Write a protein that binds this ligand. Structure first.
Ligand SMILES: *[C@@H]1O[C@H](CO)[C@@H](O[C@@H]2O[C@H](CO)[C@@H](O)[C@H](O)[C@H]2NC(C)=O)[C@H](O)[C@H]1NC(C)=O
Ligand code: NAG
Ligand code: NAG
Ligand code: NAG
Ligand code: NAG
Ligand code: NAG
Ligand code: NAG
Ligand code: NAG
Ligand code: NAG
Ligand code: NAG
Ligand code: NAG
Ligand code: NAG
Lengths: 44, 50, 287, 79, 113, 99, 113, 49
């Protein structure tokens, strides 16, 4: 590794699961509402 | 040899002081020595005060 | 000359807690509206500090030779000026330069010498019969002296020699330091109305006199004054009275302190860096 | 100190030129943002815009400063 | 000195890694292969609710393995863990934040997206 | 305001750090260059002077690099603000979630 | 050494500021508090109309306080001040530029937006 | 001299990381604009999405 010499690696604030959740939410919004959810309430 | 219009920085301006004051106190203390001259009486020349 | 005491029932010393006490000016510069941090010996906050009694009602009289570390904190809630002064030294056998900072009724006397220090020096106050005033007569602080150089008198200081048993009305704090042999005094009188559990208020300490002695030190001991009225037989064996007093002794430790300088130029707060994580967060951000 | 600085005069030349370039780049930033138009348009004296109240963004003549009440609130908010 | 699972050739004494750090040494007493791992990892962090809100703080260790909650971003002491999820304000890392809610004390939870 | 406060606080703290750099000796026996000149001869105190020169040069170079990076970020933000002005202010922009 | 309006506690001799610079020393003559301000500020600058246009220049000091016009951006000499305003070409600072206009000499004016 | 060498190496690493962070910030701003325009709607900008 690269951490033995005091070169600590900071974990990210958002995990890969949360990023995947955000991408899935954006995908669902863009297939079920188009662009209405990006500029206001989501419209079916 | 050719200078166009605009602002240009050439050198710096420094105000060099011309006089110096280094006086630390306003006055120094004294020790009792006026009693040598301001005395009721003096001594002689064969035995003078030292 | 000095005399020996007699064994009697005493009280064990107690332990109390400080509350934002032991803060002085670490330098002699002027700072306004700035949070400046310095590395110097101060008293840590919320630390268990020793307590010593001086009340009569019993017969409590304890003056141990406490070791003098790198800076001490001496706070007293003095009411009737029962305490007089302090003495210093290493062995107290006329072999080193032992200090003697006493406060007599006419003038303060500071003279570090090689006094023949006894086991328990004290100040004796006798109550006259025809005169209704308390006067000090038993000046038993040392046996003799041989030689010394430094002696300081300063301005006269007036105190009251009458001792009472009422509540305290004044608080006096003292800080004694020795850096490169230089003796440091920091004090400030503060009025208060309390008997114990020192208030959480803040009060800095300003220097009064700064002595260039350059000598050796490692131990210290305080001096006390007892009264000889008509009630006591007048012998310093088992019958005496000391009024009511209490002095606190604390040891300074090297910690970084973040001082709060106002627009006037006086210290207001002394947030620490090694006491609480919140205090460390405050002093790392300089806010 | 100045005599030994002739050995590093080129470094000071680069540093001074970099600071001058930074200053002139900061100067050019305001010209690219606020100087979009070259004609100063005056606000009309008629404030009847069909019901739209614009006094909170337009300058007011009550104060000597030309700042809007929003801008005056914005200036005092920051230090 | 942990128990390793890799054996050395019978002529070597040391052992390095990709980063060229001696992290494996054979014990001369019994020919045992032992790994080397430093102990001090990262620094400390303080969670502060803020001025005029609270006074207590929570201390977070960065990469140190241990009221006390073992989070994925180190060790967090001084903040209890609650299973529910709200919107988080003070970020910590690895998808878990901390806040001051209901008396009232500092709590740590997985943030809600 | 967060964006407008960081650009001032960072510059102020950089200036404060630049001032603080002159209070360090950088491994020499003094911080102020006048003290070594007054207490030591210039032929002997040349190496301390040169060490102070190198330390001050390093601090100034680091400050210049930090200011250049900050100026690049300010240039990018100013370009973004100019485009936002020319699109959203001087007309109506069809770009969704831009204005 | 200007006359200050802030009093000092009767045990101090020096005085610093927020930026940690000694700028207030008490004079031991009759206990006067005197501020310290450096006399040298900034550098010099020159305004040049350009080539094939003129031969004279205008010297501008960055922040030194003093034909001679006391501008907001220091001291400007060699350039007269005129109350009217045109479009400006050579920037100086604080809303004041310089130009070569009508014989003809170097003039300084507030720029027109 | 070991202190000076390690300080120089650390300063060079910090400068390289700052330049890389500036480039990453520019790329992230471009990605955010792309997400706001091509994903959260239809972008009329030709040869952008
Ligand atoms: C536009 O809005 C401003 C709000 O600032 C209005 O000014 C206020 O008017 C009320 C009604 O008389 C007063 O009580 C307030 O003191 C005013 N405030 C200020 C800051 O002036 C203004 O009247 C509005 N104008 C129109 C045409 O709607
Ligand atoms: C002596 O006394 C006179 C008058 O009392 C005084 O003016 C003078 O200063 C004193 N000292 C000396 C050295 O003359
Ligand atoms: C009281 O003082 C002792 C000795 O200094 C210390 O060990 C103890 O922890 C203190 N009490 C408390 C409650 O901290
Ligand atoms: C008080 O004590 C000092 C010595 O500490 C002595 O010089 C002085 O004369 C004493 N005062 C009286 C009135 O005896
Ligand atoms: C005082 O006398 C002692 C002898 O006992 C000597 O050692 C010491 O140096 C003397 N002090 C001074 C200041 O001369
Ligand atoms: C002072 O005391 C220390 C020990 O306490 C000793 O080592 C030193 O030599 C002494 N110095 C003098 C000048 O007596
Ligand atoms: C300090 O001085 C300022 C300015 O004169 C004054 O307003 C303030 O009351 C003073 N503070 C104290 C404690 O006297
Ligand atoms: C932390 O240490 C404990 C005991 O030493 C251990 O059980 C636990 O697995 C360790 N945590 C990790 C992540 O290795
Ligand atoms: C709530 O947290 C506790 C903590 O151990 C856990 O046992 C429980 O399953 C959690 N419940 C839910 C619904 O997450
Ligand atoms: C200035 O000197 C005189 C003596 O000539 C002295 O009386 C006065 O106190 C001094 N002023 C100070 C110390 O401020
Ligand atoms: C410049 O100096 C003159 C005289 O010394 C003075 O009247 C004027 O106020 C000064 N200008 C400023 C801005 O201080
Ligand atoms: C410019 O004109 C104004 C008009 O009132 C006058 O006050 C000012 O003095 C003039 N300035 C010069 C330099 O002539």
């Amino acid at each position: 590794a690269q951490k033995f010499n005091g070169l600590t690696v900071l974990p990210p604030l958002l995990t890969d699961e949360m990023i995947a959740q955000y991408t899935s939410a954006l995908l669902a919004g863009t297939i079920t509402s188009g662009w209405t959810f990006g500029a206001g309430p989501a419209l079916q | 040899f050719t200078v166009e219009k605009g602002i240009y920085q050439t050198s710096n301006f420094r105000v060099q002081p011309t006089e110096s004051i280094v006086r630390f106190p306003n006055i120094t203390n004294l020790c009792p020595f006026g009693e040598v001259f301001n005395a009721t009486r003096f001594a002689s020349v064969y035995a003078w005060n030292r | 000359q000095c005399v020996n005491l007699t064994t009697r029932t005493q009280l064990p010393p107690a332990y109390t807690n400080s509350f934002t006490r032991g803060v002085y000016y670490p330098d002699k510069v002027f700072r306004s509206s700035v949070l400046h941090s310095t590395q110097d010996l101060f008293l840590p906050f919320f630390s268990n500090v020793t307590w010593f009694h001086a009340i009569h009602v019993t017969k409590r009289f304890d003056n141990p030779v406490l070791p003098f570390n790198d800076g001490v904190y001496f706070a007293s809630t003095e009411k009737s000026n029962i305490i007089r002064g302090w003495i210093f030294g290493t062995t107290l056998d006329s072999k080193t330069q032992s200090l003697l900072i006493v406060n007599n009724a006419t003038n303060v006397v500071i003279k570090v010498c090689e006094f023949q220090f006894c086991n328990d020096p004290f100040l004796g106050v006798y109550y006259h019969k025809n005169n209704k005033s308390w006067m000090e007569s038993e000046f038993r602080v040392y046996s003799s002296a041989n030689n010394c150089t430094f002696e300081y008198v300063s301005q006269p200081f007036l105190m009251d020699l009458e001792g009472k048993q009422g509540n305290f009305k004044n608080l006096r704090e003292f800080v004694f330091k020795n850096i490169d042999g230089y003796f440091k005094i920091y004090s400030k009188h503060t009025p208060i109305n309390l008997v114990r559990d020192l208030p959480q208020g803040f009060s800095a300490l300003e220097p009064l006199v700064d002595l260039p002695i350059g000598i050796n030190i490692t131990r210290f001991q305080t001096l006390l004054a007892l009264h000889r009225s008509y009630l006591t037989p007048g012998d310093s064996s088992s019958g005496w009275t000391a009024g009511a007093a209490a002095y606190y002794v604390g040891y300074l430790q090297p910690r970084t302190f973040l001082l709060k300088y106002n627009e006037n130029g006086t210290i207001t707060d002394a947030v620490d860096c090694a006491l609480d994580p919140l205090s460390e967060t405050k002093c790392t951000l300089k806010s | 100190c100045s005599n030994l600085l002739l050995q590093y005069g080129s470094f000071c030349t680069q540093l001074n030129r970099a600071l001058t370039g930074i200053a002139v780049e900061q100067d050019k930033n305001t010209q690219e943002v606020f100087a979009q138009v070259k004609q100063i348009y005056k606000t009309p004296p008629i404030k009847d815009f069909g019901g739209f109240n614009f006094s909170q963004i337009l300058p007011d003549p009550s104060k000597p400063s030309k700042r809007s009440p929003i801008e005056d609130l914005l200036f005092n908010k920051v230090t | 000195l942990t128990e390793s699972n890799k054996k050395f050739l019978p002529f070597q004494q040391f052992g390095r890694d990709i980063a060229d750090t001696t992290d494996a040494v054979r014990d001369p007493q019994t020919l045992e292969i032992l790994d080397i791992t430093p102990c001090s990892f990262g620094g400390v962090s303080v969670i502060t609710p803020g001025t005029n809100t609270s006074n207590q703080v929570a201390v977070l260790y960065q990469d140190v393995n241990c009221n006390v909650f073992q989070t994925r971003a180190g060790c967090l002491i001084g903040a209890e863990h609650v299973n529910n999820s709200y919107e988080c304000d003070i970020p910590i890392g690895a998808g878990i934040c901390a806040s001051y809610q209901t008396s009232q004390s500092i709590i740590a939870y997985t943030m809600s997206l | 305001l967060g964006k407008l406060q960081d650009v001032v606080n960072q510059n102020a703290q950089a200036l404060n750090t630049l001032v603080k750099q002159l209070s360090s000796n950088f491994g020499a026996i003094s911080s102020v260059l006048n003290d070594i000149l007054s207490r030591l001869d210039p032929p002997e105190a040349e190496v301390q002077i040169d060490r102070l020169i190198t330390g001050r040069l390093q601090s100034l170079q680091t400050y210049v690099t930090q200011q250049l990076i900050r100026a690049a970020e300010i240039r990018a933000s100013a370009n973004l603000a100019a485009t936002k002005m020319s699109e959203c202010v001087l007309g109506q922009s069809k770009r969704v979630d831009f204005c």
